Write an enzyme that holds these catalytic residues in place. Structure first.
Site, PDB file in Angstrom:
ATOM      1  N   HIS A  87       0.841  -1.175   0.000  1.00 58.13           N
ATOM      2  CA  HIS A  87       0.000   0.000   0.000  1.00 58.13           C
ATOM      3  C   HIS A  87       0.888   1.239   0.000  1.00 58.13           C
ATOM      4  O   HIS A  87       2.084   1.142   0.282  1.00 58.13           O
ATOM      5  CB  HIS A  87      -0.863   0.033   1.272  1.00 58.13           C
ATOM      6  CG  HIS A  87      -1.836  -1.109   1.388  1.00 58.13           C
ATOM      7  ND1 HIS A  87      -2.999  -1.164   0.638  1.00 58.13           N
ATOM      8  CD2 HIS A  87      -1.778  -2.221   2.181  1.00 58.13           C
ATOM      9  CE1 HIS A  87      -3.601  -2.310   0.964  1.00 58.13           C
ATOM     10  NE2 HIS A  87      -2.871  -2.977   1.915  1.00 58.13           N
ATOM     11  N   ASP A  90      -1.208   8.826  -1.443  1.00 65.38           N
ATOM     12  CA  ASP A  90      -1.167   9.955  -2.389  1.00 65.38           C
ATOM     13  C   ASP A  90      -2.085  11.022  -1.781  1.00 65.38           C
ATOM     14  O   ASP A  90      -3.271  10.803  -1.576  1.00 65.38           O
ATOM     15  CB  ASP A  90      -1.736   9.560  -3.773  1.00 65.38           C
ATOM     16  CG  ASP A  90      -2.098  10.580  -4.867  1.00 65.38           C
ATOM     17  OD1 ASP A  90      -2.009  11.798  -4.645  1.00 65.38           O
ATOM     18  OD2 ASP A  90      -2.447  10.140  -6.015  1.00 65.38           O
ATOM     19  N   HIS A  92      -3.771  14.599  -2.484  1.00 69.27           N
ATOM     20  CA  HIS A  92      -4.037  15.603  -3.521  1.00 69.27           C
ATOM     21  C   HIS A  92      -3.648  17.010  -3.093  1.00 69.27           C
ATOM     22  O   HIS A  92      -3.582  17.919  -3.913  1.00 69.27           O
ATOM     23  CB  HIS A  92      -5.502  15.591  -3.906  1.00 69.27           C
ATOM     24  CG  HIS A  92      -5.941  14.409  -4.690  1.00 69.27           C
ATOM     25  ND1 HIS A  92      -7.210  14.383  -5.243  1.00 69.27           N
ATOM     26  CD2 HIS A  92      -5.358  13.251  -5.049  1.00 69.27           C
ATOM     27  CE1 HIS A  92      -7.344  13.241  -5.924  1.00 69.27           C
ATOM     28  NE2 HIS A  92      -6.220  12.506  -5.853  1.00 69.27           N
ATOM     29  N   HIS A 127      -5.541   9.091  -0.953  1.00 72.06           N
ATOM     30  CA  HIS A 127      -5.916   7.721  -1.269  1.00 72.06           C
ATOM     31  C   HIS A 127      -4.675   6.873  -1.520  1.00 72.06           C
ATOM     32  O   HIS A 127      -3.620   7.390  -1.868  1.00 72.06           O
ATOM     33  CB  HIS A 127      -6.920   7.651  -2.424  1.00 72.06           C
ATOM     34  CG  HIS A 127      -6.417   8.119  -3.740  1.00 72.06           C
ATOM     35  ND1 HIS A 127      -5.664   7.321  -4.569  1.00 72.06           N
ATOM     36  CD2 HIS A 127      -6.598   9.278  -4.380  1.00 72.06           C
ATOM     37  CE1 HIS A 127      -5.383   8.063  -5.678  1.00 72.06           C
ATOM     38  NE2 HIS A 127      -5.941   9.267  -5.570  1.00 72.06           N
ATOM     39  N   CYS A 128      -4.853   5.557  -1.439  1.00 65.98           N
ATOM     40  CA  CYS A 128      -3.803   4.634  -1.840  1.00 65.98           C
ATOM     41  C   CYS A 128      -3.754   4.572  -3.365  1.00 65.98           C
ATOM     42  O   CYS A 128      -4.769   4.775  -4.048  1.00 65.98           O
ATOM     43  CB  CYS A 128      -4.140   3.264  -1.261  1.00 65.98           C
ATOM     44  SG  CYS A 128      -2.892   2.002  -1.487  1.00 65.98           S
ATOM     45  N   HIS A 138      -7.708  -0.508  -4.959  1.00 67.09           N
ATOM     46  CA  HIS A 138      -7.494  -0.132  -3.569  1.00 67.09           C
ATOM     47  C   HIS A 138      -8.416   1.015  -3.183  1.00 67.09           C
ATOM     48  O   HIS A 138      -8.945   1.032  -2.068  1.00 67.09           O
ATOM     49  CB  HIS A 138      -6.036   0.219  -3.276  1.00 67.09           C
ATOM     50  CG  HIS A 138      -5.148  -0.969  -3.252  1.00 67.09           C
ATOM     51  ND1 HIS A 138      -4.283  -1.141  -2.187  1.00 67.09           N
ATOM     52  CD2 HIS A 138      -4.949  -1.996  -4.100  1.00 67.09           C
ATOM     53  CE1 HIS A 138      -3.632  -2.292  -2.406  1.00 67.09           C
ATOM     54  NE2 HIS A 138      -4.000  -2.827  -3.552  1.00 67.09           N
ATOM     55  N   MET A 143      -9.796   2.676   0.437  1.00 68.13           N
ATOM     56  CA  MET A 143      -8.551   3.312   0.859  1.00 68.13           C
ATOM     57  C   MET A 143      -8.504   4.745   0.387  1.00 68.13           C
ATOM     58  O   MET A 143      -7.739   5.111  -0.510  1.00 68.13           O
ATOM     59  CB  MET A 143      -7.287   2.580   0.407  1.00 68.13           C
ATOM     60  CG  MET A 143      -7.191   1.213   0.946  1.00 68.13           C
ATOM     61  SD  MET A 143      -5.579   0.422   0.933  1.00 68.13           S
ATOM     62  CE  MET A 143      -4.734   1.442   2.156  1.00 68.13           C
ATOM     63  N   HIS A 248     -26.957  17.099  -1.291  1.00 69.70           N
ATOM     64  CA  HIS A 248     -28.155  17.885  -1.065  1.00 69.70           C
ATOM     65  C   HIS A 248     -28.608  17.634   0.366  1.00 69.70           C
ATOM     66  O   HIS A 248     -28.650  16.512   0.806  1.00 69.70           O
ATOM     67  CB  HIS A 248     -29.281  17.455  -2.021  1.00 69.70           C
ATOM     68  CG  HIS A 248     -30.567  18.150  -1.815  1.00 69.70           C
ATOM     69  ND1 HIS A 248     -30.905  19.259  -2.509  1.00 69.70           N
ATOM     70  CD2 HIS A 248     -31.630  17.860  -1.053  1.00 69.70           C
ATOM     71  CE1 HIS A 248     -32.076  19.672  -2.111  1.00 69.70           C
ATOM     72  NE2 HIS A 248     -32.557  18.889  -1.220  1.00 69.70           N
ATOM     73  N   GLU A 272     -29.067  24.596  -3.798  1.00 64.57           N
ATOM     74  CA  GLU A 272     -29.922  23.467  -3.457  1.00 64.57           C
ATOM     75  C   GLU A 272     -29.111  22.172  -3.426  1.00 64.57           C
ATOM     76  O   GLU A 272     -29.250  21.370  -2.517  1.00 64.57           O
ATOM     77  CB  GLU A 272     -31.157  23.344  -4.365  1.00 64.57           C
ATOM     78  CG  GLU A 272     -30.917  22.993  -5.822  1.00 64.57           C
ATOM     79  CD  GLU A 272     -32.131  23.089  -6.738  1.00 64.57           C
ATOM     80  OE1 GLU A 272     -33.191  22.491  -6.433  1.00 64.57           O
ATOM     81  OE2 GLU A 272     -31.993  23.746  -7.798  1.00 64.57           O
ATOM     82  N   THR A 273     -28.319  21.956  -4.481  1.00 64.37           N
ATOM     83  CA  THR A 273     -27.561  20.731  -4.700  1.00 64.37           C
ATOM     84  C   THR A 273     -26.228  21.186  -5.251  1.00 64.37           C
ATOM     85  O   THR A 273     -26.172  22.106  -6.075  1.00 64.37           O
ATOM     86  CB  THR A 273     -28.312  19.836  -5.683  1.00 64.37           C
ATOM     87  OG1 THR A 273     -29.580  19.539  -5.100  1.00 64.37           O
ATOM     88  CG2 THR A 273     -27.556  18.582  -6.056  1.00 64.37           C
ATOM     89  N   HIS A 299     -28.118  13.404  -4.685  1.00 67.27           N
ATOM     90  CA  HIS A 299     -29.427  13.587  -5.279  1.00 67.27           C
ATOM     91  C   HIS A 299     -29.557  12.882  -6.626  1.00 67.27           C
ATOM     92  O   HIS A 299     -30.405  13.271  -7.419  1.00 67.27           O
ATOM     93  CB  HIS A 299     -29.822  15.068  -5.317  1.00 67.27           C
ATOM     94  CG  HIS A 299     -31.313  15.248  -5.204  1.00 67.27           C
ATOM     95  ND1 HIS A 299     -32.233  14.846  -6.153  1.00 67.27           N
ATOM     96  CD2 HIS A 299     -32.052  15.852  -4.233  1.00 67.27           C
ATOM     97  CE1 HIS A 299     -33.460  15.191  -5.730  1.00 67.27           C
ATOM     98  NE2 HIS A 299     -33.410  15.804  -4.549  1.00 67.27           N
TER      99      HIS A 299
HETATM  100  O1  LIG Z   1      -4.090  11.045  -7.486  1.00 60.08           O
HETATM  101  N1  LIG Z   1      -4.317  10.092  -8.135  1.00 60.08           N
HETATM  102  O2  LIG Z   1      -5.292   9.373  -8.464  1.00 60.08           O
HETATM  103  O1  LIG Z   2     -35.162  16.716  -1.624  1.00 61.92           O
HETATM  104  N1  LIG Z   2     -35.048  15.547  -1.670  1.00 61.92           N
HETATM  105  O2  LIG Z   2     -34.737  14.651  -2.493  1.00 61.92           O
HETATM  106 CU   LIG Z   3      -3.732   0.134  -0.707  1.00 61.37          CU
HETATM  107 CU   LIG Z   4      -5.929  10.825  -6.858  1.00 64.50          CU
HETATM  108 CU   LIG Z   5     -34.953  16.624  -3.567  1.00 61.87          CU
END
Ligand SMILES: O=N[O-]
Ligand SMILES: O=N[O-]
Ligand SMILES: [Cu+2]
Ligand SMILES: [Cu+2]
Ligand SMILES: [Cu+2]
Ligand SMILES: OC[C@H]1O[C@@](CO)(O[C@H]2O[C@H](CO)[C@@H](O)[C@H](O)[C@H]2O)[C@@H](O)[C@@H]1O
Ligand SMILES: OC[C@H]1O[C@@](CO)(O[C@H]2O[C@H](CO)[C@@H](O)[C@H](O)[C@H]2O)[C@@H](O)[C@@H]1O
Ligand SMILES: OC[C@H]1O[C@@](CO)(O[C@H]2O[C@H](CO)[C@@H](O)[C@H](O)[C@H]2O)[C@@H](O)[C@@H]1O
Ligand SMILES: O=N[O-]
Ligand SMILES: O=N[O-]
Ligand SMILES: O=N[O-]
Ligand SMILES: O=N[O-]
Ligand SMILES: [Cu+2]
Ligand SMILES: [Cu+2]
Ligand SMILES: [Cu+2]
Lengths: 334, 334, 334
Positions: A87, A90, A92, A127-128, A138, A143, A248, A272-273, A299
């Site tokens: 493992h 990484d 970001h 993440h791995c 992974h 992960m 949401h 909203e979303t 949503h």
């Molecule tokens: O950051 N690499 O997927």
């Molecule tokens: O607002 N609800 O899906």
């Molecule tokens: Cu891993």
């Molecule tokens: Cu990445």
């Molecule tokens: Cu909704």
């Protein structure tokens, strides 16, 4: 070379977040974290479906790490001999060496120490990523987590005003790929290795069997609902390391949203979303105005209600009839 | 009617981009381009899978065309008699006639000349769009590229400061739909026409078999890795004519990103992952800070690692231990 | 308690929008709307495929409701005894009680009256959400629409200038899940209840059979094409309650776009394609510059051309040869 004060952090399991300052008078520190990888078979739904998980610190998502711009993040990554696979990690948030992945590959029985300077503010995935086809596998095995890099002056609205949260939760969303047998039942496997061939075949078809928050259907519900009070400003960090999501808050809004997750950009208001691009974290803050139950979902409602991607908030306080009222309760049509 | 100077451009194959000015003292010109359509069977993966491609200028993506705001773009589109189908061109940068599609339908053996005024700045998709069900089919067969319309003053950060790139690359991402036989092997076809029925059935199920950059798995790797030096500011234009993508530079960031791709809007800063809406181009600039290999991916990691959507950068320069360092190499756990 | 003037609105079927003011000198009112739920079997394509629809006011989408910031929206929701299921309504514009859902559950034969204060500006989804797995099912059966909450000063460009539309259209996009029999033909059902088991199995696989505007393939074409004149500024509100979309006006642009749909944020300018997150509404305005036919699509072109998601505009006026011209009509290659 680096002569700065050191500060240890005790990580806590999601959805909670270790104690931290927003605005701070501290200058740069070396902030020390430890992540211990755990491969384990877990239950992911209320029917008892099992899953070969791979985790940082035993949780899906991995814990949220919180630092400030210009801190140095020094992580001890530990891969105990009780695991079966190599493992790495990484970030970001980090610059160079594939996010740290190219400097952290560890076999079972090994550990490694990586330091990176937090030059970019925002919430970010970690993440791995061992190499090749193992990378997606992974990640979708669990992960992945996130780190938050706060400005030293705390958050702002872009328009010179401060944005202080009363609490923060971290919602990590996981797309899972559990194959089915000929009967149509989910399969169980004795090891991650044994799950790999069937799991990869399914992964390449791009449709998850489950989409969950905090590792399991219903994880953030009941006793483990998120909580708030009317008047509280809550920051919700949401990550998805592999696949898009559209958060949401049902009955609420995103008052201030950084959907791309990066604090050098002003937040959008009154959403909203919002949209979390696969491979990223975003964040939304909301000041609760009404008591009661809220659902926090992706949503795509099929994913939310049928594949696992629903959390609850239970909110205490006084109902506001100005904002909403049932003028006439259900009654027979005249 | 139009009495302006004419300037010919010699297009170059992606990921490279024909020579151009950023800021310019030139006024509006008629900028002349030629695109010659080529239908051809190509290899798309390292296993030798073949594909009935349809292309502008022989490449997937088609070449990047670069002009400035207020130029007139005069394109000679040529459909040689060696092709089998009618084709046309639709520029998302252009105003009227379905982007030009309604004025450029040409049978094999024909050519047409379209001119459009570059009134909108940004990066934009162009694609074939003959009519009806042929529209998606020609696009997902490879008939798409992009055009960049620069402000005459060059790029800016929205916050009065100039943003000058040292080099630009064009990454065109292609979702491909290659059917499988009963054995489970990819099918090969003798003509685009013969591929159509099976290919359309698959297309309508919305899951690609391959997602590639520059037309093939591994195209932008090895000898053909993208390159930079520490200190260089690189613009990466990314297009996807049919399907969303979420670009990410592994080990880097998007310093300045126009994910919707349009220079009348300020860029966002400090992104981890950005989002290219299907049917659009976007652009991100990054100043490299560390040497070594980077991967540039869509951050659906299944698509990246398993379906084809990974490019590399090889970066020369001096490692910066302040930004990142391996404090302790892998060692046995104490 | 609430002593404000009352104003009734007569809703109109999409894509049209009931008459309203943009900027207004009126102060807050109680604006009264009625929605009557209709379950009905409808035809959704040109082949005669049928579909068990569930609708507000008989249409997919439900009608657009338009109010101003600070109005109170008082909705009488009616579920006649001729229906078979319970239903409710959730407004993403509203604060509390799951958007109103927790206060509006009505059996066949019942009605309910909900009032909510319009504290958030923008376009917003409304949808049914009875509980549990019924939530996605009612939404993807058609039970969704939108509301627009305008600033009292009308729209602005963020940069102090007013943005007045000459007309507004509401395009509601619906992902539909119609199962197939063993032959491969779409199935027909005698009731929504009878459609449920097969429909849910398909829904969970996340791939729609149809993606339509205004309830049917070709609904916004022919006699029912959208219309404009050169010089007219048209606002296009687009909603998708369950699944992402990427709108694009073929031959035009989004001059001013609120893709997240919320007027407290400035619009982006000069877009080719924008993005409507599943569970949201967005809006784009364009001033037409050229006559002729335009297509308005989602720019997954497979969805647009093959699954139903294409509308047309027919635009009258004078062709502008400066913006675009066919320099040389199709001719034999020299
Ligand atoms: O950051 N690499 O997927
Ligand atoms: O607002 N609800 O899906
Ligand atoms: Cu891993
Ligand atoms: Cu990445
Ligand atoms: Cu909704
Ligand atoms: O919220 C970020 C956004 O706000 C602006 C002001 O419009 O800058 C604020 O935030 C910066 C980062 O925290 C501060 O350095 C700056 O001093 C403050 O005004 C924008 O520049 C930025 O995009
Ligand atoms: O980057 C575009 C963004 O910047 C602003 C200033 O905040 O305008 C700059 O860019 C315009 C387009 O290039 C120039 O015309 C303008 O003079 C310059 O200040 C914004 O208005 C724009 O959205
Ligand atoms: O378009 C919204 C955007 O514009 C700004 C000015 O940059 O504010 C305008 O719009 C507000 C909402 O309508 C008005 O209250 C304000 O007076 C007006 O200047 C931004 O603040 C806003 O994000
Ligand atoms: O790993 N079990 O708590
Ligand atoms: O088309 N072959 O180079
Ligand atoms: O419901 N038919 O018009
Ligand atoms: O621009 N049309 O897909
Ligand atoms: Cu073509
Ligand atoms: Cu197009
Ligand atoms: Cu309902």
């Amino acid at each position: 070379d680096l002569k700065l004060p050191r500060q240890k952090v005790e990580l806590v399991a999601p959805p909670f977040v270790h104690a931290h300052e927003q605005a701070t008078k501290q200058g740069p520190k070396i902030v020390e974290f430890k992540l211990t990888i755990e491969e384990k078979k877990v239950v992911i739904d209320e029917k008892g479906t099992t899953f070969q998980a791979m985790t940082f610190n035993g949780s899906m998502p991995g814990p949220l790490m919180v630092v400030h711009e210009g801190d140095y993040v020094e992580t001890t990554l530990v891969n105990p001999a009780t695991n079966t696979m190599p493992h790495n990690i990484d970030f970001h948030s980090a610059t160079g060496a594939l996010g740290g992945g190219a400097l952290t590959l560890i076999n079972p029985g090994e550990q490694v120490v990586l330091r990176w300077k937090a030059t970019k503010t925002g919430v970010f995935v970690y993440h791995c990523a061992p190499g090749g086809p193992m990378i997606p596998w992974h990640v979708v095995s669990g992960m992945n987590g996130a780190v938050m890099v706060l400005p030293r002056d705390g958050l702002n609205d872009g328009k010179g005003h401060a944005l202080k949260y009363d609490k923060v939760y971290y919602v990590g969303e996981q797309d899972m790929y559990v194959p089915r047998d000929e009967k149509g039942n989910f399969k169980s496997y004795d090891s991650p290795g044994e799950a790999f061939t069937d799991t990869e075949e399914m992964m390449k078809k791009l449709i998850p069997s489950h989409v969950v928050f905090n590792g399991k259907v219903g994880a953030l519900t009941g006793k483990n609902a998120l909580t708030a009070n009317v008047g509280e400003n809550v920051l919700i960090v949401h990550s998805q390391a592999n696949r898009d999501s559209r958060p949401h808050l049902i009955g609420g809004h995103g008052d201030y949203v950084w959907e791309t997750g990066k604090f050098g950009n002003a937040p959008e208001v009154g959403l909203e979303t919002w949209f979390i691009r696969g491979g990223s974290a975003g964040a939304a803050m909301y000041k609760f105005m009404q008591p009661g139950i809220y659902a926090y979902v992706t949503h795509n409602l099929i994913e939310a209600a049928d594949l696992g991607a629903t959390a609850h908030f239970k909110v205490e306080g006084k109902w506001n009839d100005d904002l909403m009222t049932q003028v006439k309760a259900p009654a027979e049509i005249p």
